[PDB]
Amino acid sequence: XXNXXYX
Amino acid sequence: XXNXXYX
Numbered sequence: 090x091x092n093x094x095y096x
Numbered sequence: 097x098x099n100x101x102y103x
């Protein structure tokens with residue numbers, strides 16, 4: 090990944 | 097805020 094969130 | 101990211 091490498092992105093974040095939170096979903 | 098409250099959500100995340102990262103942009």
Ligand SMILES: *[C@H]1C[C@](C)(N)C(O)(O)[C@H](C)O1
Pocket residue numbers: 094095096098099100
């Ligand atoms: C990350 C933060 C959030 C968007 N507030 C959440 O709690 O709904 C999610 C489950 O985790």
Ligand SMILES: *[C@H]1C[C@](C)(N)C(O)(O)[C@H](C)O1
Pocket residue numbers: 091092093101102103
């Ligand atoms: C959060 C993580 C990321 C999406 N990889 C980024 O480094 O581009 C952003 C600036 O911070």
Ligand code: NA
Pocket residue numbers: 097098
């Ligand atoms: Na904030």
